Amino acid sequence: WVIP
Amino acid sequence: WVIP
Amino acid sequence: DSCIQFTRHASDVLLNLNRLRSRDILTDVVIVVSREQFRAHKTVLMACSGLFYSIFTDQLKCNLSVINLDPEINPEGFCILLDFMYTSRLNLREGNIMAVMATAMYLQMEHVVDTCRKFIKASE
Amino acid sequence: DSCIQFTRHASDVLLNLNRLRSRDILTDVVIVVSREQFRAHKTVLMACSGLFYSIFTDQLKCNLSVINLDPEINPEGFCILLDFMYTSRLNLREGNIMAVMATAMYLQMEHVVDTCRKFIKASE
Ligand SMILES: O=C1Cc2cc(Nc3nc(Cl)ncc3Br)ccc2N1
Ligand SMILES: O=C1Cc2cc(Nc3nc(Cl)ncc3Br)ccc2N1
Numbered sequence: 001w002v003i004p
Numbered sequence: 005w006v007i008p
Numbered sequence: 009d010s011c012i013q014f015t016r017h018a019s020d021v022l023l024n025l026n027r028l029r030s031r032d033i034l035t036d037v038v039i040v041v042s043r044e045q046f047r048a049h050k051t052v053l054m055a056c057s058g059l060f061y062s063i064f065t066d067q068l069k070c071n072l073s074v075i076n077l078d079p080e081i082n083p084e085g086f087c088i089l090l091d092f093m094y095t096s097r098l099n100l101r102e103g104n105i106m107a108v109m110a111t112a113m114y115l116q117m118e119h120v121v122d123t124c125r126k127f128i129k130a131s132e
Numbered sequence: 133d134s135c136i137q138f139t140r141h142a143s144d145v146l147l148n149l150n151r152l153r154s155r156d157i158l159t160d161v162v163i164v165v166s167r168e169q170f171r172a173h174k175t176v177l178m179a180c181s182g183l184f185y186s187i188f189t190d191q192l193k194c195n196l197s198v199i200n201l202d203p204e205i206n207p208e209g210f211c212i213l214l215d216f217m218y219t220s221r222l223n224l225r226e227g228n229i230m231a232v233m234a235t236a237m238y239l240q241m242e243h244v245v246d247t248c249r250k251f252i253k254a255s256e
């Protein structure tokens with residue numbers, strides 16, 4: 001999971 | 005396009 | 009093999025599937041969550057959820073145009089997850105994390121359950 | 133928004149759609165290319181091809197279960213492109229590049245046409  |  | 013690969017292909021496909029969803033094009037099922045209805049593509053639901061995969065591979069349920077979820081399922085939690093299925097983006101907030109995790113467990117969306125558990129563990 | 137994103141989601145969705153294709157699950161159209169037949173999901177074809185997008189948004193053609201391609205279309209070129217749609221991998225070879233490019237132009241698959249033109253320009 002990432003900060004888009 | 006890339007070499008997978 | 010000696011194949012070449014287009015990096016953005018999977019993302020572009022999903023973006024187009026979401027465009028079809030937004031315009032209600034070739035949607036083939038309604039998911040009923042209490043008083044709310046959500047139109048979707050069976051194939052996308054199956055590709056994202058162990059529960060939908062099991063439902064639409066059933067020889068009888070594969071032909072249903074309406075699927076009623078358990079009454080304990082929160083419509084907002086389902087909405088957030090349906091958006092995630094079609095976009096890879098999850099709108100996880102303090103106010104919705106419990107409903108989202110409970111919905112992801114029911115839908116069998118393992119990666120979503122995993123990030124919810126981690127975000128909850130960080131706030132305790 | 134304040135969304136989080138799962139990097140591998142789009143790729144995992146496509147992998148699952150290809151698994152459904154391989155097991156012939158919820159395929160809803162046959163594409164006829166001369167003597168050959170290819171089963172697929174209308175939504176995936178539309179998401180990958182300007183031609184299929186135009187065909188299945190047509191109020192009459194959207195309901196067809198069989199689509200016949202132009203007789204000039206090469207079945208192997210179509211097969212290579214159908215595999216690309218479901219996998220992001222293109223089996224581009226000296227022996228098939230002309231048929232693949234001609235098929236990608238007909239299907240309106242701009243990125244495939246682009247790499248074919250570049251690979252051809254390199255060998256001249
Ligand atoms: O957390 C998750 C997400 C998910 C998706 C599917 N979908 C499919 N799985 C397989 Cl193996 N083949 C085709 C399809 Br469609 C099955 C289980 C799960 N569990
Ligand atoms: O080279 C390409 C690939 C492609 C795909 C689509 N598909 C869609 N396009 C739009 Cl804007 N919305 C929903 C869908 Br499905 C249209 C044109 C093209 N040209």
Ligand SMILES: [Cl-]
Binds near residue numbers: 056117118119120121
């Ligand atoms: Cl997931």
Ligand SMILES: [Cl-]
Binds near residue numbers: 241243
């Ligand atoms: Cl393309």
